[PDB]
Design an enzyme around this catalytic site. Structure first.
Site, mmCIF file in Angstrom:
data_model
loop_
_atom_site.group_PDB
_atom_site.id
_atom_site.type_symbol
_atom_site.label_atom_id
_atom_site.label_comp_id
_atom_site.label_asym_id
_atom_site.label_seq_id
_atom_site.Cartn_x
_atom_site.Cartn_y
_atom_site.Cartn_z
ATOM 1 N N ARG A 121 12.469 -16.436 8.406
ATOM 2 C CA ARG A 121 11.567 -16.030 9.472
ATOM 3 C C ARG A 121 10.829 -17.271 9.943
ATOM 4 O O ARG A 121 10.597 -18.199 9.163
ATOM 5 C CB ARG A 121 10.555 -14.970 9.012
ATOM 6 N N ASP A 176 8.858 -28.640 2.781
ATOM 7 C CA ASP A 176 7.888 -29.725 2.695
ATOM 8 C C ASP A 176 7.120 -29.707 1.378
ATOM 9 O O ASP A 176 6.559 -30.738 0.991
ATOM 10 C CB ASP A 176 6.926 -29.674 3.886
ATOM 11 N N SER A 231 9.950 -27.178 7.164
ATOM 12 C CA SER A 231 8.723 -26.579 6.649
ATOM 13 C C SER A 231 8.643 -25.094 6.977
ATOM 14 O O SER A 231 7.623 -24.627 7.494
ATOM 15 C CB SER A 231 7.498 -27.292 7.226
HETATM 16 O O1 LIG Z 1 4.047 -26.157 6.475
HETATM 17 C C1 LIG Z 1 3.203 -25.415 5.608
HETATM 18 C C2 LIG Z 1 3.928 -24.236 5.005
HETATM 19 O O2 LIG Z 1 3.964 -23.114 5.912
HETATM 20 C C3 LIG Z 1 5.158 -22.369 5.737
HETATM 21 O O3 LIG Z 1 5.873 -22.393 6.941
HETATM 22 C C4 LIG Z 1 4.827 -20.923 5.426
HETATM 23 O O4 LIG Z 1 4.072 -20.827 4.219
HETATM 24 C C5 LIG Z 1 5.947 -23.074 4.610
HETATM 25 O O5 LIG Z 1 7.349 -22.994 4.780
HETATM 26 C C6 LIG Z 1 5.391 -24.491 4.634
HETATM 27 O O6 LIG Z 1 5.491 -25.184 3.400
#
Ligand SMILES: OC[C@H]1O[C@](O)(CO)[C@@H](O)[C@@H]1O
Ligand SMILES: OC[C@H]1O[C@](O)(CO)[C@@H](O)[C@@H]1O
Lengths: 480, 480
Positions: free
Chosen positions: A166, A205, A151
């Site tokens: 990042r 995700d 995620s």
């Molecule tokens: O987990 C919720 C979301 O937050 C992030 O890290 C940044 O937007 C995504 O990679 C992920 O889908």
């Protein structure tokens, strides 16, 4: 009992209001930023401040008849890590055994030097525990295929490869930045004996959420409401959508023509729309949102749409509004522990305040504030804390609708056949459990350029299936 | 391409349009009819042409934690009769074993003299047959408690008493009118040895639909969407709602005060809204709707709103539109058997026509018309047949929303809290399976006086529990 404080709060609330014209502006600007992100990139991907628009290399929407032997899955989010075993049976059915675990606090602390090995070693250990509790007979024998739901923004180069761009959502481990997270996970799996478990897929995700619904949606349900977007509204916010291969110009011309000839038409795009308008060219901003972006966040200058929408940051917005009202001698923080404790007020605290009632003298609010920061309150103070919380949430929901409306417009998903509707799959603690969030999102979709006629053609459906089924589908496809 | 036939249909279609102003008119008139029906009437109950607004003597909405021993249930509708055994476990869960049987054709013919005993004797045998197949161990020993779901207007005087007002769905047994249907059923159960089975509750399928959802709706879901209406959109149409005991003036004043003292506040009202505007003071009327009310119905002058919405009559509306287009020498019925066969075209026939597409040369329509009445067709003819079906359905859905909006407005159920939403439990073949019905209903609720803001706070949910759980709930409460 204090006309100054009463009118000071009413003024802070009005700052959070989002108008129809602002919704329309951000909708059109988001589409413009989508087009920019789909073009070849100018510089380092970790420096790009625009809509990342990351190709995921997933070009086939599940049918629902896919079937196979039990696959493994692993999902690292912003709060918890879970491992599960999914047996895809076909006919929009499956069996799942899952174990959920909180990401240890050690990884969210700078006291110690945390490394990628520390994290993926712990992940590989949880994996071993799951295979011992649910498949103890064949832990070290099978050639398990695993799909890894990550995620976090990844510079995906294939279905099985991709380097972290990042960290986000409270995660800060400089060692991982620029590392193929699949390899990192595999190396730690091999060091504990689970080299017989091969990580074959890497998905966001968002991408996983869409795939899971395309599979489980009954043939009847799917015919009317076609899943078009995979969305997340939890610790962070993000969403994916299927884009025509011809428009994904950042993809190598040969790769497009190579894909196009194979009978493919679209590819999922991980927008990473928490990083939408990181230059704050149009996103609503307050003195408290800058305080979070610059002082209290792990990634200053990035994920700014996220810092106004996702659940990791909404509770912190309240702490800064209250500390600023004590600095003005308008609000008595008493013996609270708010000061010098960022993120002590969580969004779950605000959830017990959104719908608390005055007929109960806002008792839930009173208890929730004492449990989180030893902050005492009076009724008049709780009345005004609720006015602020309800304003922070509405802005988060109204802004949460802009990326969805923008995507639907760009792809013309609403200009379908008679009686046909679409489905937006949403997973996350905010959209799922925060009182009124989904309701306020639809109010904004009705105010968006798609109008109330469009909102009724959009079905914001909670996907409590999990992104593991999606990664499981990505694993059944790939080879060991 | 007959400009005669082409514009003759375009004119019939425009007649079926329901405007926003008409929805508002019918909504406010429905509320006026609700208030009238709640006042005591002196005339014969079978002669009243207005909204019956029948008190059901059910004053407690299930919680979801109810528990008890296995109860029995019986559900007589307009097409099938089923008997089942429901064990209420609590925590919004239950065990159900059911056997379903079609109502014998002997009851759908006037050649022979049919009596109430013929019906309830056959019902008592089905009950005995069920108790022998699923509870053979204690058929003549146990003290079974049974709840009777009777899908027909009843002059309910208590939870266990009530005399039939009128039949309404294609079968008529004049003997039953004015007879406590519970007693009739009990006598036949005792006469076959099942005197140990006591019918302790009588419910309408609307009342049962509401109760079942209040029980099965998870506490989380119940907190969000509160069930407020239990409605039916199948063979017939009807719905129930909770009314303040003080407004139900028809109920004895003393009996009310005794209920109020017991901690009661409301009581379910079986609107019987199929009999709404039987005088046609405002309901849309066509040459085809008059043909059905006076020539082809079993109860001319009654259930007129039903005759424009419910599935027993929708297919017949098409048959008369087609026969009227042949009498004008505009449509060639060829060797069809439509003429002199009322109700030969069913709503199931129209369901295969609502969403058929031209890319398939409207083949489902061609086959569905051949399967139902040996009617051949051409592509250009089917193009216009779909416009008729789609016009009959849209009017039916738009009209189906008027009773719901009226009820929500009268009780102000949508503005009871900040993030307030409601749940409308819908059971029936039309709302459940007819393509686009719910979609068109919501389009009308948004045009109703509750506005698009109100429609978004209304959740039209299919009730996949059944009225058997509801009747079981009324039996677990009542005494043996
Ligand atoms: O987990 C919720 C979301 O937050 C992030 O890290 C940044 O937007 C995504 O990679 C992920 O889908
Ligand atoms: O079955 C649907 C509905 O049809 C009626 O018979 C007449 O409107 C009602 O008694 C029932 O609730």
């Amino acid at each position: 009992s204090d006309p100054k404080l009463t009118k000071a709060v009413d003024s802070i609330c009005d700052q959070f209001i989002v108008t129809k014209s602002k919704i329309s502006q951000l909708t059109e600007y988001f589409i413009d930023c989508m087009e920019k992100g789909l073009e070849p990139c100018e510089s380092d991907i970790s420096q790009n401040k625009g809509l990342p628009m990351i190709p995921t290399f997933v070009t086939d929407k599940p049918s629902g008849q896919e079937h196979g032997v039990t696959m493994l899955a692993a999902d690292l989010g912003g709060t918890n890590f879970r491992v599960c075993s999914v047996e895809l049976l076909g006919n929009h059915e499956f069996k799942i055994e899952q174990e959920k675990s909180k990401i240890p606090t050690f990884f969210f602390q700078d006291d110690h030097h945390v490394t990628s090995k520390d994290l993926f070693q712990h992940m590989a250990l949880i994996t071993h525990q799951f295979l011992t509790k649910h498949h103890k007979d064949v832990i070290q024998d099978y050639k398990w295929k695993m799909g890894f739901t990550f995620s976090y923004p990844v510079d995906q180069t294939s279905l099985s490869s991709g380097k972290l761009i990042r960290w986000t959502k409270g995660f800060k481990i400089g060692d991982t930045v620029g590392q193929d997270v699949v390899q990192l996970f595999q190396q730690e799996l091999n060091d504990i004996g689970l080299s017989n478990v091969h990580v074959v897929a890497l998905t966001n995700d968002t991408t996983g959420t869409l795939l899971a619904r395309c599979y489980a949606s009954s043939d009847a349900a799917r015919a009317i409401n076609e899943p078009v977007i995979g969305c997340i509204f939890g610790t962070g916010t993000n969403g994916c959508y299927m884009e025509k291969l011809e428009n994904i110009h950042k993809l190598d011309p040969a790769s497009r023509e190579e894909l196009l000839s194979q009978g493919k038409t679209h590819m999922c795009i991980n927008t990473e729309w928490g990083s939408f308008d990181n230059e704050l060219n149009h996103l609503p901003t307050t003195s408290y949102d800058i305080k979070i972006d610059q002082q209290f966040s792990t990634n200053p200058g990035f994920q700014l749409f996220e810092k106004r929408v996702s659940g990791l940051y909404l509770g912190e917005i309240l702490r800064n509004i209250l500390l600023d009202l004590e600095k003005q001698e308008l609000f008595d923080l008493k013996e609270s522990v708010l000061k010098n404790n960022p993120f002590i007020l969580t969004t779950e605290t605000l959830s017990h305040i959104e719908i608390d009632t005055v007929e109960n003298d806002l008792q839930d609010t009173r208890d929730a504030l004492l449990k989180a920061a030893d902050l005492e309150t009076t009724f008049e103070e709780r009345v005004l804390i609720q006015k602020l919380v309800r304003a922070i949430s509405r802005r988060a929901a109204f802004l949460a609708a802009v990326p969805i409306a923008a995507i639907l417009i760009k792809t013309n998903a609403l200009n379908q056949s008679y009686h046909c509707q679409v489905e937006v799959g949403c997973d996350g603690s905010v959209v799922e459990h925060y009182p009124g969030f989904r309701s306020m999102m639809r109010h904004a979709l009705a105010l968006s350029p798609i109008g109330p006629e469009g909102e009724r053609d959009v079905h914001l459906r909670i996907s409590k299936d999990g992104s593991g089924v999606g990664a499981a589908l990505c694993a059944l496809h790939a080879n060991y």
